[PDB]
Design a protein around this nucleic acid. Structure first.
Lengths: 48, 271
RNA sequence: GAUAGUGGCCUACCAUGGUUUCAACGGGUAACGGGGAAUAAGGGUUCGAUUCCGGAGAGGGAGCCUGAGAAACGGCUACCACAUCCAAGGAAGGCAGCAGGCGCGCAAAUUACCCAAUCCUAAUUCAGGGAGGUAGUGACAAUAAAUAACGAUACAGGGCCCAUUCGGGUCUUGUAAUUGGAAUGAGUACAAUGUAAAUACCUUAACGAGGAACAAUUGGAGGGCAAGUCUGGUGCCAGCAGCCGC
RNA sequence: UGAAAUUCUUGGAUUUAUUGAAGACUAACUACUGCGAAAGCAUUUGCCAAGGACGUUUUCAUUAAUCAAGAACGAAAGUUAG
RNA sequence: CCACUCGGCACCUUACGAGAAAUCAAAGUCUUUGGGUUCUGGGGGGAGUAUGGUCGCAAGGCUGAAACUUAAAGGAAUUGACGGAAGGGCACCACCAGGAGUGGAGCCUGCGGCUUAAUUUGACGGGGAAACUCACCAGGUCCAGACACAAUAAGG
RNA sequence: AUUUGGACAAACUUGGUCAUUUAGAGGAACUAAAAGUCGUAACAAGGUUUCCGUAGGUGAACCUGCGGAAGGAUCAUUAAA
């Protein structure tokens, strides 16, 4: 488990051009900053 | 900006190899998907800006004369030049001459050069650069000549000049000074080290300012005929220039020289 | 000398030994050891906190009284660390027992009933036992297996032989939210059994379906790898994402 | 030298001839080969000390094979001191 | 020189056999898998890098990682497509011997451009030309539309 | 009650050392789903036997010494069959 610090518009360029939807998190157990992908939500409307 | 930049990129994707395949125009552009590259190449081919050479197991793309000048227009969008294109006055051998206009609205002259795959384009480029440098040499020496604007890789854009050739010019009032001018100017040519052998009636162009002040000039366009004085046959070339001036002034202007005209041995103590 | 008792266990006095590439000694362990567990044609690989046996500890160290047996934590004493009440003088404390709370984290149950079993303790048949048993919570795993089964009709076929043609029956399909009479538990519940008392199970009077809803879901349909030559939108969040990708 | 320019030469270069000094190499012969544990070794002659193969009706009678530990040698280049 | 025998450095065939192949008398006697023994490697980078130890005056040597990153990096063999090699035809839509010339003057005629209200439209269009042909403009006009179906009727 | 000396020995203080949780403060470097600038972007092309060890000068690059390897394409021409 962790706490969302940011929403990230990562970019995948070649050969597939897509806008990856990710989230920078700080984990609760460690104090460790980890980015992670979030699927199926184009809006990230379930995430703040 | 962007589509012209990618068309400049595939222009720069020509100075890598010979006849360029499809995936090099895919990847030199470096665009997003199949869409932009393939639909751009189809827009090229349907406007005859590109052609397909399918040599066995090998697709390739053949650029004709069409899909270049846009980039030159883009190259001339950079250098403040022409906005509107097309008015045919003169279809020459090694160039096609058009009357064009800028954003500012002044009419100019667009000589496109057509002299394939690299060599037609590149030899038109060498011809345009060579003529631009010769124009630069003539204007640097101070010869009255049209002022060059630019040489967009193989298309020379220059000024328009209000002149008409001497075949439709009956005479002027100051005929012996015109003869002294057309002697002393070939003298100045020999003092440059060059002889323009085609010094004919159709070459010499006169602008006409007024009828009282008499402040006018001349325009001399003999570019694939100028020959250095060191060559084998320059003697009678100089003499053909002098004698065509003299036979025209005897036939048209009915003027015979009272001072003797310059010879090549006269002008050997020049430059 | 000390001990219950050998023994450098310790003390005095002597020697200068002891271990080691057949790996001593030091270091690490997210190491309690084993019976065992998972997985395989064989040989092996990886786990074993965890129901049985043995060890160790009761916040960390130490010391001790009593007693056959303790260096005992539901016994004491002191220090260290926390922490409780207080009229400020003093006084009490150990849930790694059964329940339960905070904290921690991906991660884990009821502050229930009972000694009727199984055993154990005592002065003892009777008293006591969160040991243990019972029930709740419980999709940790494991076993068994409801969500429908028969007809008649038509209609479309197919096949079997008689077809000279009709039609004579035997099957088997498909449908037709067409029709018929049946069967039964999920559930509710007199009672009885069950049990320490119950709850539940096994029985059983009385109800309980056409089930157009006592409604089965979870992941997929390019290839690996069973399944679309289908339609619409997308094609400015979109050739896209275990791998290859079009 | 693809091309060209610095240097030396009228007191004479370069080249020619007769000499002398220094240090380094050991061609052609030189493979269709030889030796050495490898690196490596090509002029003559001598000294020293080894070595392989061959031959043996000589001797000893398992003394052996491969080798962590350890040990010698090791082209070229490079360090210090003559 | 001939014949034999050891012990070498090399050669040349084959394939019985091996190997992915080039090839190999060992790189054979290996799934029908075991003569003895030493050392080394486990996809590619990061990296022979960092740190520690040791050896050395120095240069360096030996020993030697991880984090992180990635679907290939490779080994052998095989084909012809962008070879800008040279050689012949064999031609007056090429050159030399020339002849007639065009582009030089005026005009006819086809295209482009401009202009327009249209200068209709193609790249000779049998496109020779006031009407037609006309395919283009300025206008003015007819004739639309079946059957079904609600009304309306022969004095309309 | 108090008290001498012993062994057992919890702890406490003082330093000095590693091993850390930190907080702060000081600096340095890496990045951009960031944005504008000049330098060689909007510029020309160029080198191309390949390597190995060692030494040197270097510059955006890379060259030169010394010694090895082929992981480089043996034609002809003497003889043989």
């Amino acid at each position: 488990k962790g706490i969302v610090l940011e929403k990230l518009g990562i970019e995948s360029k070649q050969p597939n051009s897509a806008i990856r939807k990710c989230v920078r998190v700080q984990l609760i157990k460690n104090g460790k900053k980890v980015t992670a992908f979030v699927p199926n939500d184009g809006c990230l409307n379930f995430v703040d | 900006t962007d589509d012209f930049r990618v068309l400049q990129a595939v222009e720069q994707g020509s100075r890598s190899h010979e006849v360029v395949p499809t995936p090099l125009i895919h990847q030199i552009s470096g665009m997003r998907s199949q869409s932009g590259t393939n639909r751009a190449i189809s827009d090229l081919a349907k406007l005859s800006l590109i052609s397909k050479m399918r040599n066995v197991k090998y697709d390739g793309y053949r650029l004709t004369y069409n899909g270049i000048d846009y980039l030159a227009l883009k190259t001339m969008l950079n250098r403040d030049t022409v906005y509107s294109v097309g008015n045919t006055i003169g279809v020459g051998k090694e160039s096609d001459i058009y009357k064009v206009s800028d954003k500012n609205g002044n009419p100019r002259v667009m000589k496109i050069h057509r002299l394939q795959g690299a060599n037609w384009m590149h030899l038109s480029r060498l011809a345009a650069n060579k003529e631009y440098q010769f124009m630069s040499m003539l204007y640097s020496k101070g010869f009255k000549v049209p002022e060059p604007f630019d040489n967009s890789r193989h298309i020379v854009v220059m000024e328009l000049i209000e002149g008409y050739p001497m075949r439709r010019l009956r005479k002027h009032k100051n005929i012996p000074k015109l003869y002294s001018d057309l002697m002393c100017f070939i003298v100045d040519l020999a003092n440059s080290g060059l002889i323009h052998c085609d010094f004919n009636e159709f070459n010499i162009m006169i602008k006409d300012k007024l009828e009282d002040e008499n402040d006018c000039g001349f325009v001399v366009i003999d570019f694939p005929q100028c020959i250095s004085i060191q060559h084998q046959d320059a003697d009678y070339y100089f003499q053909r220039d002098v004698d065509c001036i003299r036979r025209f002034f005897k036939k048209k202007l009915k003027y015979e020289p009272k001072p003797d005209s310059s010879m090549l041995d006269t002008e050997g103590f020049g430059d």
